[PDB]
Each structure stands twice: as structure tokens, then as C-alpha cells.
Amino acid sequence: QKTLHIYNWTDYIAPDTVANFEKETGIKVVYDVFDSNEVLEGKLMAGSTGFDLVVPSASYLERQLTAGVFQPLDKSKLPEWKNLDPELLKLVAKHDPDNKFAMPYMWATTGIGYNVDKVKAVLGENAPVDSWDLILKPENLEKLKSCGVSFLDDPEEVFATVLNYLGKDPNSTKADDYTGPATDLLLKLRPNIRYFHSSQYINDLANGDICVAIGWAGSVWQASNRAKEAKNGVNVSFSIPKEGAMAWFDVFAMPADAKNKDEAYQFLNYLLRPDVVAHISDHVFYANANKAATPLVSAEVRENPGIYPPADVRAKLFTQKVQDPKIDRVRTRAWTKVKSG
Numbered sequence: 289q290k291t292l293h294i295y296n297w298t299d300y301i302a303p304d305t306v307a308n309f310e311k312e313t314g315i316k317v318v319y320d321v322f323d324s325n326e327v328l329e330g331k332l333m334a335g336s337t338g339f340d341l342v343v344p345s346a347s348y349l350e351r352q353l354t355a356g357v358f359q360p361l362d363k364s365k366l367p368e369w370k371n372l373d374p375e376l377l378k379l380v381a382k383h384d385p386d387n388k389f390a391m392p393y394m395w396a397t398t399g400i401g402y403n404v405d406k407v408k409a410v411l412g413e414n415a416p417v418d419s420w421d422l423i424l425k426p427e428n429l430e431k432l433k434s435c436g437v438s439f440l441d442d443p444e445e446v447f448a449t450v451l452n453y454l455g456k457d458p459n460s461t462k463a464d465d466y467t468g469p470a471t472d473l474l475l476k477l478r479p480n481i482r483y484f485h486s487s488q489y490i491n492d493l494a495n496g497d498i499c500v501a502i503g504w505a506g507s508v509w510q511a512s513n514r515a516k517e518a519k520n521g522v523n524v525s526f527s528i529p530k531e532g533a534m535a536w537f538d539v540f541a542m543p544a545d546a547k548n549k550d551e552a553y554q555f556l557n558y559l560l561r562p563d564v565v566a567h568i569s570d571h572v573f574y575a576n577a578n579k580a581a582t583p584l585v586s587a588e589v590r591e592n593p594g595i596y597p598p599a600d601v602r603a604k605l606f607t608q609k610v611q612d613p614k615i616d617r618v619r620t621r622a623w624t625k626v627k628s629g
Contacts, residue, residue: 368560392577401508436498443623532604
């Protein structure tokens with residue numbers, strides 16, 4: 289008997305991906321889900337997780353690669369590795385030099401999800417839905433306050449987003465940038481933010497309970513699709529703003545103590561087949577990292593510039609740099625101060 293234990297994000301695979309794989313290979317898949325980088329990272333650090341494959345964000349690889357939790361990927365066992373987009377491989381390679389440990393899986397940005405109808409009512413037909421001004425100017429948040437404003441509970445992405453908006457380095461290594469100008473703007477915005485949460489905005493957007501959110505691209509598009517399936521007339525859309533946004537990448541990695549390496553490699557190469565990962569993108573509304581798969585993705589998804597951004601939008605994206613622990617601790621304390629007062 290052959291078995292394979294996978295640990296992936298919630299809502300990050302198609303409903304029949306595992307079943308198709310099991311039909312094709314005869315391998316028993318045990319599939320478990322998390323919904324936070326810290327829950328996965330806290331299992332990885334305790335060791336002996338029992339997982340053969342896990343899906344961390346690329347920025348979390350650097351911290352974990354120095355701890356020696358993953359083992360290098362045998363490229364010869366992945367003949368379809370050549371299907372991966374080389375540009376995405378280079379961006380992930382900033383956290384994983386020579387792409388030794390991680391296979392790019394899906395990627396997206398952190399932008400603005402919003403209720404199209406609610407925003408136009410409150411802010412007029414010319415609401416700045418293409419700008420962070422929509423959610424980072426107090427004058428606007430005061431108007432959108434009553435219809436619901438939410439921010440991610442993510443100090444790394446929110447501070448980077450605020451810094452970029454103010455004209456600073458999105459990955460500034462200067463402590464005063466976080467406690468000074470970034471905290472000032474966040475404190476001005478705070479009284480108009482209903483909550484800081486990294487998943488409640490999804491269903492809230494879909495149901496009409498909040499009208500604007502800082503959120504992950506594919507999760508906002510899932511909320512938009514949920515409202516469409518529910519036939520509730522709620523029109524959710526998503527915006528990568530003109531000032532740029534953070535792009536991030538989730539990757540498959542193999543723990544060093546994985547018991548089913550052969551089966552793990554079979555599943556990776558399975559994912560590299562163009563139709564397998566195109567099918568996932570169709571259902572989760574995230575762009576996969578496979579360049580051969582792109583034309584196979586449904587037109588509604590691949591021609592959506594908020595999922596597959598064109599070259600001009602990609603040029604405005606920035607990525608997460610791993611900060612020195614000194615700056616991590618400054619970020620956490622300031623975030624706590626922002627969320628309270």
C-alpha cells in the first residue's frame with residue numbers, strides 16, 4: 289500500500305484533485321488543511337509532522353531553510369518542472385536560491401476587495417477603486433465606515449502596504465518608519481475599521497456585510513463567485529491599485545523526514561501537468577505558477593487582470609523581504625498599538 293500526507297491551505301485545491309490523483313496512481317492521500325503561515329510554521333518547527341508535502345509562503349522558506357526542515361527536490365523525478373514560469377521561479381528564488389527546495393504553486397496579491405454597488409452609492413460613480421486612496425484616506429473611510437471596512441490581521445502585509453503608499457520602502461529596515469508615519473496613518477484610519485481579520489472578510493464581502501476590505505486576491509474573487517452562485521445580487525470585485533501592491537507566492541515543499549518521498553514526487557509531477565493545476569485555478573481563482581497551464585485556465589480567470597496581471601501591473605508589484613528579528617518585534621508591538629489605541 290502507498291500513502292501520501294499533504295498539508296495545504298484551505299480552499300486551495302479543486303474538489304476532485306485528490307480523487308483524480310488517487311484514481312490515476314493508486315496512492316492513498318491523507319489531505320489536511322490549515323489557514324495560517326504560523327500554524328504550519330509552528331508544526332514544522334516542532335518536528336516530525338507526519339506530512340510528506342506542505343505549502344508555506346515563499347517568504348517563510350528562508351527562516352525554515354536555515355532550520356533544515358525541508359530536503360532538496362530531486363529535479364530528475366519532476367520531468368514537467370520545465371512547465372513552471374521562469375520569472376516566478378526567479379521571484380521565489382529570492383527566498384530559495386537556485387530553487388533547491390520549493391516548487392511554485394499559486395500566487396496572488398494583497399489589494400482591495402469591495403462591494404461595487406455600495407462603494408458607488410457612498411463615494412459616487414467616480415470612486416477611486418483603482419487607488420489605495422479608496423481605503424487609506426480617512427475622508428473615504430469615514431464615508432464607508434457604516435457599510436463595513438475590514439483590514440487583514442497581518443502586520444507584515446499591512447505595514448508594507450502603508451509604507452509603499454506613503455512613498456517609503458515597502459520593506460523598510462528603519463524602525464521609525466513603522467512607529468512613525470505608518471502608525472500615524474493607521475491610527476487615523478482605525479476608528480473607521482470595523483475589524484482586523486484575515487478570513488471573516490471573505491463571507492462578509494459575499495453577503496454584503498462589509499463594503500471594502502484589505503484582502504488576498506483569490507479569496508476576494510472566491511467571495512465574488514459565492515455571491516454570484518447565491519444569486520443575491522451582491523457585486524464583489526477586487527483591485528490591484530495603481531500605486532502597486534504586495535505579490536506573494538505559495539510553494540510546495542517536502543519535509544526532510546518525509547516517509548513517502550516517491551509518492552510526494554508523483555504528486556508534484558501530477559501538479560506540473562498543465563490541466564491539473566489549470567483546473568485548480570479555475571476553482572480557487574488563484575493564478576498558478578505553471579506557464580504551460582495558462583491557456584488551459586478558463587477565460588473568466590486567465591483574462592482577469594486581478595488574477596493574472598499584465599506586465600504593466602506586475603512591474604508595480606513588490607515582494608516581502610525577511611526582516612531582521614529586531615524589526616519583526618517592532619512591527620508586532622506597533623500592530624498591537626494600532627489595533628487598540
